[PDB]
Symmetry: C3
Subunit: 295 residues, 3 copies
């Protein structure tokens, strides 16, 4: 049922480094054709650092692990009209023969299915603000707690509740480590105000943790949090307030906040988002190559 | 081989024919005698009339049974609340003590999945309770469905519970939730919850195709289909909702907690509504049995 | 190998003799040197005296150890609180960095399950913290027990934590919870929690039959047995001190890694050693009943 691209299939069969990539960043992070440009630049960074990129999406009901140029452009061109597909939506998107842009929870599922150990993303979903009134908590976190894969993120955006997100990850048995810092990063910016529960200082360090996790057959995964580079590192609070006073909820809520943050920052937040996923791709690829060498 | 599968259920499973799992806590605990027995038998009949084989699940003298005889349904109904209300976490204890257990959604999920039944019909699923922010009272039904790949066919979640938070928790647990032929998530006794359904399916065949995909993908999380109570009962919803609110207030003012709480609320609502809520409960489980059996048959045809 | 199994534990596993897992955070962090070592030896002796083999679990120089020698116990105890408190999520990192780690319930569950040990004695399990409704601080011990089919033998949950919410969370995770010979769920240092136990078991054989059924059913969730501290082994004092310690931690914003050690230390200071003495008594009692459960289970099988 799942279609693995020729390049990814070759790599997996030969034990070469593969880096999984998600597609909601393509459909919902930015408009066409900038979304396509970024996805291709991310894939190029993966290839230029010795790994094979496996962008995951669902197209016409077919889960695809590894996308061709045609599939990337086709996905990107549909823009925000593509179904944002969490793990729980996969079966429905398949059954309806639809297109789906897979989130972290869905991409985890497919990456694990075929034995990809490293999954590069921008930021992971989290515990939402005021969750003690709503219980709005991303399935990304639950999925990572029972999928043994390493997610390479730039931390968690302050749109979400970062302290509670860290607590929920801990409850779900997810190892969380910041890269070359004692501070947990906050996606757009390096400062979250939260201490990192653990630290790793090199791609080789990361690969050794992953290797141990694999060998032990633990069922919980890992969140690496790579602070956005210092050269690429009010709007959130105002966007949040506006969000409440205009009662934006459900599926509209998260796209509204990110868009508002981008508008209020005049493109600065999106630019940072682009910079961080590229940085995650660099470090993630180095981790994957180091891991492949270990194995 | 701790579990006993009846000849009728084993015959169906071995031949890839449609089977619908049914729970037994609605019999011993969820409904009074003898409507509890009457309804259980009528549900099994509806399952058969639509081409599937009913598999009511319970534990009898420490033996997990998948497929029950009429005398066993009668025993569960007659012994009533003296039968252990058996959640998944109670199964081992009821087996060890050689007791009788009427299985809830979390326990019935476990046994149905164990023997390869894909469709499980119930009235409603447990949920996040009201004031869960102070209590953290959240049904194991939700956790169980998040890690058991089976389709539960319900009429949604009762307003006794916190429906918006229940929907959030299901999402966090990776459970696909879809309302049947509606954009509104149903609230058990009534179709009106005030909550948008996160997804929608419009036919038994639609449902079967989602289940089929879930199976082929080997996902470990399950599915909640939520079937709004038939329109013929819509006039009763405001009444049952009003009584629900009064019963909740009464439970609080009388400090009814623990194992007493849920039975108190169901009984009180039926008393306040003069039997209307039980009548609605009977109608919705019959409707769920109808649609659930059609889903199971469609799925069997797909495979 | 993935793990180093001690000669005594390996022999027991191969010959079907009852084995009781033990954790090491109680040694490195839960108790001071040398009371920690003294108690660990006494607990292991109690396990042996009732017909089982103790398997204290830790990570030493990056190697998971199942079963410890006298030398290794001395090592964990003397290095004390400088050893990494190692939850399940920390195992891979402690292994990768070749470090020493004292394993909590969530980590010890993982290693016990790996080698097929069914009974794991601890003092108390982590829980839902007070004010979790603001913090969402909920121990991974609970999540782990909900998806690891092992019987944890505890003395309940300390009132430093939110006992009612801990019981609710365990229920949500499908963990069977039973108090031993009581209708009241125990509160670690003291037998009185003010919470009714959701279920009750009255003998080690009762417990073993529940475990046996859980095993035969292939359920993926575990069991918490809660053994009330012996009536002869101050409860009134430790509860009063607990309330005071909680207030102090709040007024001083003690958070993160500092919080739980602060509360346990403060309660012991405020009670003049009474709570540590109770902690020693309850882990010995858990070892007694837990080993009897493990032997009864081995006999059943
Ligand atoms: Mn959400
Ligand atoms: Mn409950
Ligand atoms: Mn904690």
């Amino acid at each position: 049922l799942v279609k693995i691209s020729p390049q990814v299939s070759e790599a997996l069969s030969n034990g070469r480094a593969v880096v999984a990539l998600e597609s909601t960043i393509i459909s919902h992070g930015m408009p066409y054709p900038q979304n396509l440009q970024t996805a291709k630049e991310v894939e190029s960074i993966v290839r230029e650092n010795g790994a094979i990129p496996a962008t995951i999406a669902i197209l016409n009901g077919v889960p695809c692990i590894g996308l061709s140029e045609e599939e990337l452009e086709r996905l990107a061109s549909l823009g925000k009209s593509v179904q944002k597909t969490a793990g729980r939506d996969i079966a429905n998107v398949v059954a309806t023969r639809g297109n789906g842009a897979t989130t972290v929870s869905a991409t985890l599922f497919f990456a694990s299915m075929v034995g990809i150990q490293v999954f590069v993303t921008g930021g992971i979903g989290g515990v939402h603000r005021h969750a003690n009134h709503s219980m709005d908590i991303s399935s990304d976190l639950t999925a990572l707690g029972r999928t043994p894969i390493a997610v390479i993120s730039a931390g968690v955006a302050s749109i979400l509740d970062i302290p509670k997100t860290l607590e929920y990850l801990e409850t779900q048995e997810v190892y969380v480590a910041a890269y070359k810092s004692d501070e947990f990063p906050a996606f757009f910016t390096e400062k979250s105000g939260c201490k990192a529960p653990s630290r790793v200082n090199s791609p080789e360090d990361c690969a050794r943790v992953i290797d141990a996790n694999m060998k032990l057959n633990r069922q919980a995964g890992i969140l690496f949090a790579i602070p956005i580079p210092k050269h690429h590192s009010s709007a959130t609070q105002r966007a949040l307030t506006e969000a409440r006073e205009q009662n934006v909820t459900g599926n509209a809520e998260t796209p509204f906040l990110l868009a508002r943050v981008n508008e209020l920052t005049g493109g600065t937040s999106l630019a940072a988002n682009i910079a961080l996923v590229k940085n995650n791709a660099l470090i993630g690829s180095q981790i994957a190559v180091a891991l492949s060498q270990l194995m």
